[PDB]
Write a protein that binds this DNA or RNA. Structure first.
Ligand SMILES: [Mg+2]
Ligand SMILES: [Mg+2]
Ligand SMILES: [Mg+2]
Ligand SMILES: [Mg+2]
Ligand SMILES: [Mg+2]
Ligand SMILES: [Mg+2]
Ligand SMILES: [Mg+2]
Ligand SMILES: [Mg+2]
Ligand SMILES: [Mg+2]
Ligand SMILES: [Mg+2]
Ligand SMILES: [Mg+2]
Ligand SMILES: [Mg+2]
Ligand SMILES: [Mg+2]
Ligand SMILES: [Mg+2]
Ligand SMILES: [Mg+2]
Ligand SMILES: [Mg+2]
Ligand SMILES: [Mg+2]
Ligand SMILES: [Mg+2]
Ligand SMILES: [Mg+2]
Ligand SMILES: [Mg+2]
Ligand SMILES: [Mg+2]
Lengths: 60, 70, 141, 145, 55, 143, 67, 63, 206, 80
RNA sequence: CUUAAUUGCGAUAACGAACGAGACCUUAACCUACUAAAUAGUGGUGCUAGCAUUUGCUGGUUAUCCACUUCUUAGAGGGACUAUCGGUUUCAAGCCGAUGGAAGUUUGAGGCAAUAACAGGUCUGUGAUGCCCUUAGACGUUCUGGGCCGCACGCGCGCUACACUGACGGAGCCAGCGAGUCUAACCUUGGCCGAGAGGUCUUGGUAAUCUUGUGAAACUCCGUCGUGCUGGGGAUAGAGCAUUGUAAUUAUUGCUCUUCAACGAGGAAUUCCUAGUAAGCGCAAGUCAUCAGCUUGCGUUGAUUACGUCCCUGCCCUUUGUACACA
């Protein structure tokens, strides 16, 4: 959860009203044992604007 | 600097002759007798315990308790 | 693989996990006998489940507990809970019900919250004070 | 520890290092009223003098005291680490001293003068009876002078 | 210079400490018009035709 | 019946271990003991004054016996308490990385601890030996 | 304070008005009735309505209720 | 000292402009059947027992 | 008492009393009783406990405060004056010493002495500031049993904390002392004087 | 070059996107329309575009030195 | 009448609705039920150490394997509706007690929040902006240095204290919210050297993987000191060593020795608060090259006393008066 705590006022006047925004990050991983034919079929498809897919290999 | 930060041989006798009838004996008890400062008062406690007069019923620092021997 | 259950206990944020396997009556806390739990004035708080329910009842079991989180008091109130919740979880699967319901009866009639986990929890502070209810000082000029 | 039964040997107030030292107080802390020597320094010295810290000041056979003075005014010949001392890299001969109980009053002046006599802004600030370490002088320190 | 700095009499703690405090020190806000805020000062007054034209 | 050190009240164990390293003499203390402070966040040296290297070594020993491995940087943080900063708020401050590194070394040359891999210091197979011994000697006073 | 809003009471009214040959004095079954009989956007709201159709039900059995 | 035990009969309400005072009728346990309404100080519920220091004196509205 | 020994052993003194009478540190929650009428139902002895450290939801309702083991309500009020807020383990230890101190003097089961003191110091009647107009007289009132107990806990604990300040005697000794002198008042305990003078001024306005 | 690609796209029935109708007010009052007319038509077009409700506010100063404001709202809106 | 609420009940020339309150949303609480996880963790087994030996007890082993999901994680669901019973009450909304329950003070804490008003603050956040001013000896801009810290004093927020529920010294030793380095030098384990601050050699980490179990602090334990401005207190100040930075003088910070002030619980006054709350206690984050006695959050230890009223103060509501309506 990415918190950002800030006064609302651009200036300084008034009671000290604070305000905190958050940005929540959800990170999954799914481990697959597959050949090259599916993984490349599955990387082009299932794209989604706003879901960052990352595919790594190498148990090392 | 107010009376009895030392041994004062007569005072040793005082302790041996006065601890009887002490239902409660502790650090604050030994000083209250116009007598030993707290440091050497704390040394008497393990001494009068070396044999007899006092029975250790409390345990630790910041509070001691002894009682007439029976 | 013998008769065995695992149970937990949660005070403020401490959790005390406790596996109850059939054995010859030992009770360890993270590595050590229940006779060394010391902040030590509360020692009879974690003995308490043993004495409410009689010093027997353990000769056929071994209890081990490890507490992560909390603090020098919150952990002590969580182990007793997992110890008693586990002694009553063991009579769930292995001994019969009537023995078990006698145990819930003899704890809850004393119950420093021994089977029931205390819902109290730190309230979130809000801007304007060092506390959650407390406010900063003001002056009116 | 023990119960001791000293004779009339133990003495009340005793004088050394041009000062006065209370007899019925612990010797480590008794040496503290001597200026320039504090809790740490008194401790290490008595340790170095091979003296029983549990003894009061009125104890300490005269040999022990004369030793305790000797080590105080020569810490470097008796292996005291030259960062245990109030005057190192002196300002003129560069040696490592330890100013003691009347000289420390002298060396505060010695120093304060070296600044005034040179017109360093610090000195000027002393001569004006102000704070020199840089603290704000608006709010604090109003009774003093 | 710094020579004049320490040589200067009429300087340093003792001197000031020996001076009475000005009474302007322990004053108030003086507030200078907080209670004529609503009474506009432009002396003009926007008309009503130029308002109805606009809005 | 069998004995671990985890079967012993942590205080009297170390005290019993303290007397041991004392009674023995195979120590390798530095020598600047009685003059060092044991942390910047301290006012006065320890009151043992001949000792407290035994006490810490004994403490140090038990702590490393209790776990996989620790470092000097860990003992700094463990043995460090709160430093009064005069008029300013208290803060935790780490202790001397010299006392500890020399306690680790003086116990390793005495064969109670070894430089574990993965970094750190591991309880010596020979320390297991000697610890559970004096632990069993501690539960001898209570027989 | 636990005075139910109108929408709660209004709904309970409307339900007892037309599904009395159902909705016993048990809330739990009234809950499970509400899902199938009425569209409610949240569990909390539905529980708050069913809990009240229950009350209004339970006192009808002793005497009428106006509304 | 003639001490007087008196069980609280009923809670009547808060007198006193601040409010810390409560009007309550009591029943003595020795020789019951006669009631007295007393002004209490601490927080009181029904069936508590008040030590009336003097028996025959009752109070009313406070300011 | 039919002892039982399992793998990791429970000590005899431990084994002994626990499954026996369910008593205090080593004091008896039994025959201790209130030498007065109400102040019963507002002192807790029976039910019994081992030590006075209980995470009890005693505040979230009005009167349920009166169900706390009174011995523990004695401690709770020790741990205050700011610097000592929190610090119950401190207090919990002060009581055990106090009770043991009080035990030594005048044998008198000490959890009964604590009862006697709380009883013997609660001002039976008191006064408030009724308006009357500008110049406010004082109307006598009869203080409740709960306020009677509560006030006895603060009254005792305070003047004893005030005693143990700036002096060689400890908190437990002064606490023991004030308690002992309050088990049947002796005109020398800081408490009794306040109690007596709260029923002296509640008398002068009647 | 190539690693970025832009594609315009007609927006589906603009009368239900705030941002569109805001920049319409702008491109009316700059083009000189009567403030009440300009805002009132926008509300009318958004409504005929099938909204549950709409609300236009104009704040600032027109031709008069003093600043004013005007709510122009029709239909249904909730706010909490 | 009731409610925290124009919240409802009831009365009723009104009947029946909408905005706002509620609903809703977020977070903290409950799941041995659902889907699993070598970046979370358990039991078994190898392989392995120590003590007892009688089979045990206590550990080691980022894959030697098997299985599980209670503990941790977060998806989907479920759960509470002030439930059941009982007192009180126009026996109305409701309220109070008791049992049960993770939870029954709007469950706790917030987020959102109508119509309206203010000449409230902000042109010094904006390449938002009208007008006015200025525009080359510039009110543009950059560079060098100083200043915002200046010291008879008045006011406000704070920090640390006056000690024995304590300082100090050893020993025990337990959290949670966080952050962390690519075209780069953030978070740093470990090994050495150094009393210390630090230094030096390496290393893990773009992170539930490494720093970190953040072994935090209060706290708990055994000692020393003993009521004395004392070893409480740590201002002022001298002398030395180090780090950040081009730069530390008016001393950024840190460390060492020394110096050892006021302050013996605070007049009139006045602030904050009702349960994991108050107070005590540290920590992370913001700022940040370096500097927190500030702030935003966080967990740890954990009370006393109400559970009331309108007396003081403040504000709402009717009634009522008005020659006010720029009110
Ligand atoms: Mg000195
Ligand atoms: Mg620590
Ligand atoms: Mg420590
Ligand atoms: Mg301090
Ligand atoms: Mg709405
Ligand atoms: Mg699960
Ligand atoms: Mg209940
Ligand atoms: Mg203005
Ligand atoms: Mg602006
Ligand atoms: Mg400024
Ligand atoms: Mg402020
Ligand atoms: Mg100090
Ligand atoms: Mg300490
Ligand atoms: Mg060096
Ligand atoms: Mg790398
Ligand atoms: Mg002093
Ligand atoms: Mg005070
Ligand atoms: Mg910072
Ligand atoms: Mg600031
Ligand atoms: Mg209220
Ligand atoms: Mg009118």
């Amino acid at each position: 959860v990415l918190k950002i705590s800030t006064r609302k006022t651009p200036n300084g006047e008034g009671s000290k009203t604070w305000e905190t925004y958050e940005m929540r990050i959800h990170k999954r991983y799914i481990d697959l044992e597959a050949p090259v034919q599916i993984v490349k079929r599955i990387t082009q498809i299932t794209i989604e604007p706003g879901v960052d897919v990352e595919v790594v290999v190498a148990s090392n | 600097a107010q009376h009895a930060v030392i041994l004062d041989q007569e005072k040793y006798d005082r302790i041996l002759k006065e601890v009887p009838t002490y239902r409660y004996v502790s650090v604050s008890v030994l000083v209250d007798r116009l007598k030993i400062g707290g440091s050497l008062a704390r040394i008497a406690l393990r001494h009068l315990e070396k044999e007899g007069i006092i029975k250790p019923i409390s345990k630790h620092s910041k509070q001691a308790i002894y009682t007439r021997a029976t | 693989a013998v008769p065995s259950v695992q149970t937990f206990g949660k005070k403020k944020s401490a959790t005390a996990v406790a596996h109850v396997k059939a054995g010859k009556g030992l009770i360890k806390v993270n590595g050590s006998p229940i006779t060394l739990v010391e902040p030590e004035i509360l020692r009879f708080k974690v003995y308490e489940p043993l004495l409410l329910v009689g010093l027997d009842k353990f000769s056929n079991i071994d209890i081990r507990v490890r507490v992560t989180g909390g603090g020098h008091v919150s952990q002590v109130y969580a182990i007793r809970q997992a110890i008693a919740k586990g002694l009553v979880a063991y009579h769930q699967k292995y001994v019969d019900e009537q023995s078990k319901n006698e145990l819930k009866k003899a704890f809850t009639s004393y119950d420093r919250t021994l089977l029931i986990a205390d819902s109290r929890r730190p309230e979130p502070k809000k801007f304007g004070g060092k506390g959650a209810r407390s406010r900063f000082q003001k002056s009116y000029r | 520890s023990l119960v001791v039964q000293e004779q009339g040997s133990f003495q009340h107030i005793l004088r050394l290092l041009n000062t006065n030292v209370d007899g019925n107080i612990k010797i480590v802390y008794a040496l503290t009223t001597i200026k320039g020597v504090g809790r740490r320094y008194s401790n290490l010295v008595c340790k170095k003098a091979d003296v029983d810290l549990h003894k009061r000041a009125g104890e300490l056979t005269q040999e022990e005291l004369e030793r305790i003075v000797q080590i105080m005014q020569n810490p470097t010949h008796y292996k005291i680490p030259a960062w245990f001392l109030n005057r190192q890299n002196d300002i003129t001969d560069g040696k490592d001293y330890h100013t003691l109980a009347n000289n420390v009053e002298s060396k505060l002046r010695d120093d304060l003068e070296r600044l005034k006599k040179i017109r360093a802004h610090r000195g000027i600030r002393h001569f004006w009876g102000l704070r020199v370490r840089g603290q704000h002088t608006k709010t604090t320190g109003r009774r003093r002078a | 210079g710094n020579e004049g700095a320490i040589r200067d009499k009429t300087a340093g703690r003792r001197n000031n400490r020996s001076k009475d405090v000005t009474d302007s020190a322990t004053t108030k806000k003086s507030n200078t018009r907080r209670a004529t805020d609503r009474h506009s000062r432009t002396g003009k007054t926007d008309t009503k035709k130029k308002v109805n034209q606009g809005w | 019946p069998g004995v671990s050190v985890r079967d012993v009240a942590a205080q009297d164990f170390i005290n019993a271990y303290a007397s041991f390293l004392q009674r023995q003499g195979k120590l390798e203390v530095p020598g600047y003991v009685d003059i060092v402070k044991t942390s910047s966040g301290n006012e006065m040296p320890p009151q043992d004054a001949e000792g407290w290297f035994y006490k810490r070594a004994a403490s140090v020993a038990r702590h490393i016996y209790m776990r996989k491995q620790v470092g000097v940087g860990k003992l700094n943080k463990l043995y460090g308490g709160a430093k009064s900063r005069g008029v300013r708020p208290y803060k935790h401050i780490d202790a001397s990385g010299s006392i500890n590194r020399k306690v680790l070394q003086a116990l390793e040359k005495i064969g109670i601890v070894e430089i574990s891999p993965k970094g750190g210091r591991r309880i010596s197979e020979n320390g297991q030996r000697d610890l559970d011994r004096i632990a069993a000697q501690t539960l001898e006073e209570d027989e | 304070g636990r005075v139910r809003t109108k929408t709660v009471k209004r709904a309970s009214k409307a339900l007892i008005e037309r599904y009395y040959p159902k909705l016993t004095l048990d809330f739990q079954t009234n809950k499970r009735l509400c899902d199938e009989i009425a569209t409610i956007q949240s569990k909390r709201l539905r529980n708050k309505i069913a809990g009240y159709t229950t009350h209004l039900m339970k006192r009808i059995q002793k005497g009428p209720v106006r509304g | 000292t003639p001490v007087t035990l008196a069980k609280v009969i009923k809670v009547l309400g808060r007198t006193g402009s601040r409010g810390g005072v409560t009007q309550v009728r009591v029943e003595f346990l020795e020789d019951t059947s006669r009631t007295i309404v007393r002004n209490v100080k601490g927080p009181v519920r029904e069936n508590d027992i008040l030590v009336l220091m003097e028996s025959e004196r009752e109070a009313r509205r406070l300011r | 008492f039919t002892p039982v020994v399992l793998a990791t052993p429970i000590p005899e003194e431990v084994q002994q009393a626990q499954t026996e009478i369910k008593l205090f540190n080593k004091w008896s929650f039994e025959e201790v009783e209130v030498k007065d009428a109400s102040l019963v139902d507002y002192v807790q002895v029976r039910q019994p406990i081992f030590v006075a450290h209980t995470a009890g939801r005693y505040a979230n309702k009005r009167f349920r405060k009166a169900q706390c083991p009174i011995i523990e309500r004695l401690t709770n009020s020790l741990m205050m004056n700011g610097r000592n807020n929190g610090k119950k383990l401190k207090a919990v230890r002060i009581i055990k010493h106090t009770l043991d101190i009080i035990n030594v003097l005048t044998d008198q089961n000490p959890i009964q002495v604590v009862v006697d003191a709380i009883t013997n110091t609660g001002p039976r009647e008191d006064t408030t500031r009724v308006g009357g107009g500008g110049a406010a007289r004082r109307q006598a009132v009869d203080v409740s049993p709960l306020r009677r107990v509560n006030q006895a806990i603060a009254l005792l604990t305070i003047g004893a904390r005030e005693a143990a300040f700036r002096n060689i005697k400890t908190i437990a000794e002064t606490l023991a002392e004030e308690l002992i002198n309050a088990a049947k008042g002796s005109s020398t305990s800081y408490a009794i004087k306040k109690k007596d003078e709260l029923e002296r001024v509640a008398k002068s306005n009647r | 070059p190539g690693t970025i690609v832009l594609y315009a796209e007609r927006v589906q029935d603009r009368g239900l996107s705030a941002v569109a109708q805001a920049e319409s007010m702008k491109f009316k009052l700059l083009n000189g329309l009567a403030i009440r007319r300009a805002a009132y038509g926008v509300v009318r077009y958004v409504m005929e575009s099938g909204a549950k409700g709409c609300e236009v506010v104009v704040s600032g100063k027109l031709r008069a030195a003093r600043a004013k404001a005007m709510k122009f709202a029709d239909g249904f809106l909730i706010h909490s």
